[PDB]
Amino acid sequence: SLPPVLAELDPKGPAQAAGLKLGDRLQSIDGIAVDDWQQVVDSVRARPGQRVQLKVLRDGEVLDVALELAVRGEGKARSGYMGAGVAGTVLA
Amino acid sequence: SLPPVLAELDPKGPAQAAGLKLGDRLQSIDGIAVDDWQQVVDSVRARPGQRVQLKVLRDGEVLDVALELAVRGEGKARSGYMGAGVAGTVLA
């Protein structure tokens, strides 16, 4: 259960465009508390093109972040994409 | 029908905290196109405490904005509040 703390960002992805930063902790997605990183991955992958709203903890302050998920892959593999990852080898 | 173009902001309100700015045009709320300012007023007033996601046009660029609506009033008058208004005398 990996903590949902951002360690990488795609410079051309939705997450950076939305104002997310390395070190941010994702607290909720569309009002649903985030348990771990896999929950984010699963939710993002299922939602190509969708608006999503986040509660984010940054340096002790809670902020609201909005983004529109992009799309990667084709056919069965076509998925939502946020352009953010956690430590290790972990990408959403 | 008043265009949903921000002309005033409460410095302690959710809108300024969310990164909204004077001159911003509200294009959608929670995925629903904004027709006019009264639609914003009506939607905000109905949603005390609620997360809302906006599409916003700022100087030709569309961005995604998230906020949590605050609360004002008491009893029957208790309503959601965003802390933004349009030109004239108009506030949401």
Nearest to B56 by CA among B91, B38, B29: B29
In terms of CA atoms, which chain B residue is nearest residue A52? B53
Provide the β-strand partners of residue A10: none
CA B59 – CA A76 distance, rounded (Å): 38
Name the domain count of chain A. Answer: 1
Phi, psi for residue A15 in degrees, rounded to 5: -65, -50
Q: Rg of chain B's alpha carbons, rounded to an integer?
A: 12
Residues in chain B: 92
Q: Which residue is it, tokens 């259960």?
A: A1
Q: What residues of B are in contact with residue A67 (Cβ under 8 Å)? A: 64
CA A31 vs CA A52, A53, A64, B10: distances in Å:
10, 8, 11, 25
Q: Which residue is it, tokens 């045009």?
A: B25
CA B27 – CA B61 distance, rounded (Å): 12
CB B28 within 8 A of CB B54: yes
How many CB atoms sit inside 10 A of residue A29's CB? 19
Task: Report the relative pairing of strands B61-68 and A70-72 from DSSP bridges.
Answer: unpaired
Counting other chains too, the contacts that B48-53 makes at CB distance below 8 Å and 24 or more residues apart are B48/B78, B48/B79, B48/B80, B48/B81, B49/B80, B50/B80, B51/A30, B51/A31, B51/A53, B51/A55, B51/A64, B52/B82, B53/A51, B53/A53, B53/A66, B53/B29
CA B6 vs CA A3, B22, B27, B29: distances in Å:
38, 5, 12, 14
10-69 in chain B: CB under 8 A from chain A: 18-19, 30-31, 51, 53-55, 64-68
Phi, psi for residue A88 in degrees, rounded to 5: 110, -160
CA A42 vs CA A34, B1, B24, B61, B75: distances in Å:
11, 42, 33, 30, 41
CA B28 – CA B89 distance, rounded (Å): 23
Parent domain of B67:
1-92
Nearest to B23 by CA among B57, B53, B66: B57
* Number of helices (H), then strands (E), in chain A: 2, 8
Nearest to B92 by CA among B2, B15, B34: B15
CA B4 – CA B37 distance, rounded (Å): 5
Q: What residues of B are in contact with residue A64 (Cβ under 8 Å)? A: 18, 51, 66-68
